[PDB]
Enzyme design. Structure first.
Site, PDB file in Angstrom:
ATOM      1  N   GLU A 118      -0.423 -61.385  30.916  1.00  0.00           N
ATOM      2  CA  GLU A 118      -1.195 -60.357  31.590  1.00  0.00           C
ATOM      3  C   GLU A 118      -1.003 -58.994  30.926  1.00  0.00           C
ATOM      4  O   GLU A 118      -1.974 -58.262  30.732  1.00  0.00           O
ATOM      5  CB  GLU A 118      -0.802 -60.255  33.061  1.00  0.00           C
ATOM      6  CG  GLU A 118      -1.692 -59.297  33.831  1.00  0.00           C
ATOM      7  CD  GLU A 118      -1.039 -58.753  35.081  1.00  0.00           C
ATOM      8  OE1 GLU A 118       0.077 -58.190  34.981  1.00  0.00           O
ATOM      9  OE2 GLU A 118      -1.644 -58.881  36.161  1.00  0.00           O
ATOM     10  N   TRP A 158      -6.030 -63.653  37.870  1.00  0.00           N
ATOM     11  CA  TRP A 158      -7.166 -62.731  37.987  1.00  0.00           C
ATOM     12  C   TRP A 158      -8.516 -63.411  38.141  1.00  0.00           C
ATOM     13  O   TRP A 158      -9.506 -62.753  38.480  1.00  0.00           O
ATOM     14  CB  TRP A 158      -7.252 -61.792  36.788  1.00  0.00           C
ATOM     15  CG  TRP A 158      -6.366 -60.605  36.867  1.00  0.00           C
ATOM     16  CD1 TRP A 158      -5.058 -60.525  36.481  1.00  0.00           C
ATOM     17  CD2 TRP A 158      -6.715 -59.316  37.381  1.00  0.00           C
ATOM     18  NE1 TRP A 158      -4.570 -59.265  36.721  1.00  0.00           N
ATOM     19  CE2 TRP A 158      -5.562 -58.500  37.274  1.00  0.00           C
ATOM     20  CE3 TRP A 158      -7.889 -58.770  37.921  1.00  0.00           C
ATOM     21  CZ2 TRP A 158      -5.547 -57.166  37.691  1.00  0.00           C
ATOM     22  CZ3 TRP A 158      -7.875 -57.443  38.335  1.00  0.00           C
ATOM     23  CH2 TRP A 158      -6.711 -56.656  38.216  1.00  0.00           C
ATOM     24  N   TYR A 213      -7.214 -52.104  35.096  1.00  0.00           N
ATOM     25  CA  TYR A 213      -6.080 -51.676  34.264  1.00  0.00           C
ATOM     26  C   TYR A 213      -6.365 -51.534  32.776  1.00  0.00           C
ATOM     27  O   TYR A 213      -6.245 -50.436  32.234  1.00  0.00           O
ATOM     28  CB  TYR A 213      -4.880 -52.613  34.445  1.00  0.00           C
ATOM     29  CG  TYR A 213      -4.287 -52.585  35.830  1.00  0.00           C
ATOM     30  CD1 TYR A 213      -3.743 -51.417  36.355  1.00  0.00           C
ATOM     31  CD2 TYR A 213      -4.287 -53.724  36.625  1.00  0.00           C
ATOM     32  CE1 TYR A 213      -3.212 -51.388  37.643  1.00  0.00           C
ATOM     33  CE2 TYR A 213      -3.764 -53.707  37.907  1.00  0.00           C
ATOM     34  CZ  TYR A 213      -3.228 -52.541  38.413  1.00  0.00           C
ATOM     35  OH  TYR A 213      -2.707 -52.531  39.688  1.00  0.00           O
ATOM     36  N   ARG A 242       5.184 -34.982  30.420  1.00  0.00           N
ATOM     37  CA  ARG A 242       3.833 -35.381  30.770  1.00  0.00           C
ATOM     38  C   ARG A 242       3.514 -36.773  30.234  1.00  0.00           C
ATOM     39  O   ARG A 242       2.343 -37.167  30.170  1.00  0.00           O
ATOM     40  CB  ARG A 242       2.801 -34.390  30.225  1.00  0.00           C
ATOM     41  CG  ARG A 242       2.818 -33.016  30.834  1.00  0.00           C
ATOM     42  CD  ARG A 242       4.007 -32.234  30.356  1.00  0.00           C
ATOM     43  NE  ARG A 242       3.718 -30.805  30.187  1.00  0.00           N
ATOM     44  CZ  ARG A 242       2.914 -30.299  29.257  1.00  0.00           C
ATOM     45  NH1 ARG A 242       2.298 -31.111  28.399  1.00  0.00           N
ATOM     46  NH2 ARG A 242       2.725 -28.986  29.198  1.00  0.00           N
ATOM     47  N   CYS A 269      -2.778 -51.439  42.009  1.00  0.00           N
ATOM     48  CA  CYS A 269      -1.570 -51.366  42.821  1.00  0.00           C
ATOM     49  C   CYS A 269      -0.600 -50.417  42.165  1.00  0.00           C
ATOM     50  O   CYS A 269       0.166 -49.725  42.830  1.00  0.00           O
ATOM     51  CB  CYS A 269      -0.923 -52.741  42.959  1.00  0.00           C
ATOM     52  SG  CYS A 269      -1.136 -53.424  44.602  1.00  0.00           S
ATOM     53  N   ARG A 325       1.598 -48.176  44.918  1.00  0.00           N
ATOM     54  CA  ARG A 325       1.191 -47.703  46.237  1.00  0.00           C
ATOM     55  C   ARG A 325       1.474 -48.751  47.312  1.00  0.00           C
ATOM     56  O   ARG A 325       1.596 -48.426  48.492  1.00  0.00           O
ATOM     57  CB  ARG A 325      -0.284 -47.374  46.224  1.00  0.00           C
ATOM     58  CG  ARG A 325      -1.102 -48.566  45.886  1.00  0.00           C
ATOM     59  CD  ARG A 325      -2.540 -48.251  45.934  1.00  0.00           C
ATOM     60  NE  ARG A 325      -3.286 -49.468  45.687  1.00  0.00           N
ATOM     61  CZ  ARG A 325      -3.528 -50.399  46.600  1.00  0.00           C
ATOM     62  NH1 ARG A 325      -3.091 -50.245  47.853  1.00  0.00           N
ATOM     63  NH2 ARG A 325      -4.178 -51.507  46.245  1.00  0.00           N
ATOM     64  N   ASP A 344       4.144 -56.384  47.956  1.00  0.00           N
ATOM     65  CA  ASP A 344       4.657 -57.459  48.796  1.00  0.00           C
ATOM     66  C   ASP A 344       6.039 -57.740  48.189  1.00  0.00           C
ATOM     67  O   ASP A 344       6.132 -58.266  47.081  1.00  0.00           O
ATOM     68  CB  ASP A 344       3.753 -58.691  48.682  1.00  0.00           C
ATOM     69  CG  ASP A 344       4.225 -59.854  49.554  1.00  0.00           C
ATOM     70  OD1 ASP A 344       3.424 -60.358  50.383  1.00  0.00           O
ATOM     71  OD2 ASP A 344       5.396 -60.263  49.395  1.00  0.00           O
ATOM     72  N   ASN A 346       6.051 -57.504  39.226  1.00  0.00           N
ATOM     73  CA  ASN A 346       5.796 -56.132  38.813  1.00  0.00           C
ATOM     74  C   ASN A 346       6.988 -55.541  38.079  1.00  0.00           C
ATOM     75  O   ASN A 346       6.828 -54.898  37.042  1.00  0.00           O
ATOM     76  CB  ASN A 346       5.466 -55.282  40.041  1.00  0.00           C
ATOM     77  CG  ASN A 346       4.341 -55.873  40.876  1.00  0.00           C
ATOM     78  OD1 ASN A 346       4.170 -55.536  42.034  1.00  0.00           O
ATOM     79  ND2 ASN A 346       3.566 -56.753  40.279  1.00  0.00           N
TER      80      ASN A 346
HETATM   81  O1  LIG Z   1       1.057 -57.073  40.860  1.00  0.00           O
HETATM   82  C1  LIG Z   1       0.737 -57.129  42.022  1.00  0.00           C
HETATM   83  C2  LIG Z   1      -0.284 -58.043  42.435  1.00  0.00           C
HETATM   84  C3  LIG Z   1      -0.621 -58.083  43.765  1.00  0.00           C
HETATM   85  N1  LIG Z   1       0.014 -57.249  44.689  1.00  0.00           N
HETATM   86  C4  LIG Z   1      -0.426 -57.361  46.120  1.00  0.00           C
HETATM   87  C5  LIG Z   1       0.707 -57.557  47.167  1.00  0.00           C
HETATM   88  C6  LIG Z   1       0.062 -56.966  48.463  1.00  0.00           C
HETATM   89  O2  LIG Z   1      -0.058 -57.979  49.469  1.00  0.00           O
HETATM   90  C7  LIG Z   1      -1.334 -56.542  47.995  1.00  0.00           C
HETATM   91  C8  LIG Z   1      -1.897 -55.366  48.819  1.00  0.00           C
HETATM   92  O3  LIG Z   1      -3.199 -55.049  48.325  1.00  0.00           O
HETATM   93  P1  LIG Z   1      -3.869 -53.850  49.169  1.00  0.00           P
HETATM   94  O4  LIG Z   1      -4.036 -54.298  50.691  1.00  0.00           O
HETATM   95  O5  LIG Z   1      -3.037 -52.640  49.117  1.00  0.00           O
HETATM   96  O6  LIG Z   1      -5.309 -53.541  48.559  1.00  0.00           O
HETATM   97  O7  LIG Z   1      -1.116 -56.198  46.595  1.00  0.00           O
HETATM   98  C9  LIG Z   1       1.002 -56.380  44.266  1.00  0.00           C
HETATM   99  O8  LIG Z   1       1.572 -55.646  45.045  1.00  0.00           O
HETATM  100  N2  LIG Z   1       1.343 -56.327  42.953  1.00  0.00           N
END
Ligand SMILES: O=c1ccn([C@H]2C[C@H](O)[C@@H](COP(=O)(O)O)O2)c(=O)[nH]1
Lengths: 281, 281
Positions: free
Chosen positions: A62, A84, A110, A151, A170, A190, A193, A201
């Site tokens: 990825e 994806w 991305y 920066r 994310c 932001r 899980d 990640n």
């Molecule tokens: O690399 C990744 C891939 C998927 N998610 C997922 C986990 C959360 O359940 C989901 C939340 O998506 P939103 O509801 O914020 O759109 O993102 C990540 O956090 N990181």
């Protein structure tokens, strides 16, 4: 020195003790806290979590995918990674109002934002060379010419391109820092899980750092992981508690076999994780 | 519970006990640490540092200034706040290669990125009505119809406009979180001057949270301040040691004496920092 994975497990423990119930887009209940931070050292070891196996192949492939600037899931799928493909489905697009896009066209995700920020997106197979900003290369360029710079940032959050993305990023933005010929990277997620995403990640951005460190003649320093909404699915609370009792096995090591000079010149073969002895589940 | 100001003081003690020597664009010199995070409660109190007075007048005015969408330093200047005048002189502009740009025009900075992200910047006098993405209002909007949303973000980092800016924004982005009627916000600050800077920021954004809370009918929750390159200037080292010995005074309480509808119709008179008892400067 305590094992690095302890911070991650601690964050989970903190979600349970201090977290509150918060529903997600689908209405499903979760347990979350807002704002968290962990520091993983990248010195002589790679922070690939052991209390549960991490889909490394997905991680490595990825990333290389993002580097190529690809926005066609098919290209990542052809490598054995399908994480994806869902968003690249025919019927999936139609419901988002992209009935005109072909299967695989994810939009300005991305890859695009990384090397053509600000450019006018159109097709997952148009020519963007010379268009927008190549944050990735720029970040590398800055590391070399001005390492004290504050920066060194790569932002994937494009308010303008949001409506065109299969889903908002994310990983909003990451920052690089240089001191004592050591490379550190902080990432702003932001939402994450804690059981499924975060581990994958952590690897990604740790791997990216290794790469840019290698390309810039530096030593990996620290990987700071900053979270926005740190959550756990309420139904996964029990399995997690079991995992929280596992003892972290020493972290694996990442080795780049051949020497590389440009970032795009990295290939799946160039890397190799050794000593990854994760817990089964 | 302990006094919230301890978070800030603690971070200074840390930067002193672990910050490594690092220079800036001027090559000045400072102790630095990469990756810090502090939580500040906004419940029945306002984090307005007491171990050292804060330019509140400046914070409050500057924010209203951002909201307005103004990119003219003469605006904030004509209020008793010149902190942005320096980067708006006839000299500073030419220095950066903006001979055409007339004195005051700071370029597409915060106010612009906040209400017109993406819109092609012309000049501080241009009309941007109906241009770019009004992040501020969009955030307010989401918090009202979908508080669980994990994408509530306000990003001031626009790679395409960085060159046109009088200086890169220290506040990359911010994310809002809502749970149990309580509104929280987290700021990602790439660079932070622990001495005179962070204290001010902690306030600027805590105020932003309160304001948005008021117009959305939610109560203030937490303000999570996340730093990237956290530093203490070498000379500030002494003046700080004394401050570290000063007992923190109970945080004041912001008071919004007037029912404001939208974010635009806000006035400096609408606020009052009750019982704010700083320390001898
Ligand atoms: O690399 C990744 C891939 C998927 N998610 C997922 C986990 C959360 O359940 C989901 C939340 O998506 P939103 O509801 O914020 O759109 O993102 C990540 O956090 N990181």
């Amino acid at each position: 020195p305590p094992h690095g994975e302890l911070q991650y497990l601690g964050q989970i423990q903190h979600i349970l003790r201090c977290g509150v119930r918060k529903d997600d887009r689908t209405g499903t209940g979760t347990l979350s806290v807002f704002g968290m931070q962990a520091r993983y050292s990248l010195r002589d070891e790679f922070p690939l979590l052991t209390t549960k196996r991490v889909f490394w192949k997905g991680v490595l492939e990825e990333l290389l995918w993002f580097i190529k600037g690809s926005t066609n899931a098919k290209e990542l799928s052809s490598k054995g990674v399908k994480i994806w493909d869902a968003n690249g489905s025919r019927d999936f697009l139609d419901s988002l109002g992209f009935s005109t896009r072909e299967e695989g066209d994810l939009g300005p995700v991305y890859g695009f934002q990384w090397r053509h920020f600000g450019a006018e997106y159109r097709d997952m197979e148009s020519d963007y060379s010379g268009q927008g900003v190549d944050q990735l290369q720029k970040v590398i360029d800055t590391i070399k010419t001005n390492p004290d710079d504050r920066r060194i940032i790569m932002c994937a959050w494009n308010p303008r391109d949001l409506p065109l993305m299969a889903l908002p990023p994310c990983h909003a933005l990451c920052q690089f820092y240089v001191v004592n010929s050591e490379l550190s990277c902080q990432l702003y997620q932001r939402s994450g899980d804690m059981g499924l995403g975060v581990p994958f990640n952590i690897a990604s951005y740790a791997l990216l750092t290794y790469m840019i460190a290698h390309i810039t003649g530096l030593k990996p320093g620290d990987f700071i992981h900053t979270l926005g909404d740190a959550h756990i699915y309420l139904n996964h609370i029990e399995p997690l508690k079991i995992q929280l009792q596992r003892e972290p096995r020493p972290f694996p090591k990442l080795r780049i076999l051949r020497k590389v000079e440009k970032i795009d010149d990295f290939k799946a073969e160039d890397f190799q994780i050794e000593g990854y002895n994760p817990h089964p589940t």
